[PDB]
């Protein structure tokens with residue numbers, strides 16, 4: 444650990460943990476393509492288990508990046524096309540409002556107002572279909588972005604249909620395995636429960652609860668090591684040997700839509716680098732008009748590529764700059780203000796060139 448990296452990391456994370464009351468936290472910095480790890484506090488306050496490099500943390504929305512990439516991998520294999528209508532992979536979606544809504548709109552939250560979350564009452568597959576048939580668009584497709592688990596989560600589910608595989612099998616087989624993310628899961632196996640940190644909310648230890656389209660929108664758990672590897676694969680896709688997975692990573696970083704200084708990829712979100720920290724940090728249900736990027740701009744190396752995520756008891760953040768071979772991962776078992784995460788991440792990366 445170069446003292447440089449050591450000092451900026453600690454100078455930054457320490458006051459953060461104290462101000463936010465974060466019980467446990469793991470940080471990885473990818474510098475010149477090499478990971479450096481750091482860890483603080485507790486994975487389980489009660490059983491006094493410290494956070495280590497093997498601790499699993501709930502990723503929350505950062506899970507969408509895996510989905511964007513899995514989806515991009517399905518495109519690469521010629522199994523789906525973002526230009527296909529949604530109904531091509533779910534012919535039972537015969538309600539009229541769906542004509543014109545494409546897999547692209549699903550993956551980028553531009554379908555016309557699909558809700559932030561699938562309602563808790565949706566139990567079964569039959570319940571999911573009904574929910575979608577009855578959903579009433581507030582806007583025409585491709586006009587506004589409204590961040591949503593029901594939007595991407597559906598994209599993920601359909602993206603894997605032609606393969607005959609379930610979303611978990613597809614994810615494990617086409618993404619976790621090739622990239623050697625052997626400690627990343629949608630369902631934490633009994634053998635790895637000893638490392639599953641607890642989340643904390645209002646002082647109580649909690650874990651994410653099951654829900655429809657959970658795997659696809661916020662269901663991944665992973666370690667600081669695998670997340671650092673996940674960042675290295677996204678920084679340098681051209682080292683990935685699996686052809687389709689390589690294009691897939693590239694496709695998830697293509698710029699499909701623009702909102703202010705932000706560009707929407709598949710899961711990942713991007714801004715041109717150099718970037719103002721304020722342009723990312725503090726400037727809900729924020730509907731935002733979007734401009735289509737026709738055709739999409741291929742992955743741009745001079746970008747600040749990122750994704751924020753949370754569950755009831757976890758706060759996570761990932762951000763990297765391809766052009767600089769620079770990256771960072773922040774995993775905490777306490778959801779804390781998103782602006783403090785980006786503020787911390789920028790302070791570290793910008794300090795490393």
Ligand SMILES: *C(=O)[C@](NC(=O)[C@@H](C(=O)O)c1ccc(O)cc1)(OC)[C@@H]1N=C(C(=O)O)C(=C)CO1
Nearest residue numbers: 503504505560592654661727751752753754755
């Ligand atoms: C992504 O992190 C985010 N939230 C979540 O994924 C989960 C959470 O909020 O704890 C989650 C779990 C179960 C659900 O039915 C819904 C969400 O995506 C929704 C985060 N949360 C937001 C919010 O609660 O409004 C956002 C606006 C940004 O993304």
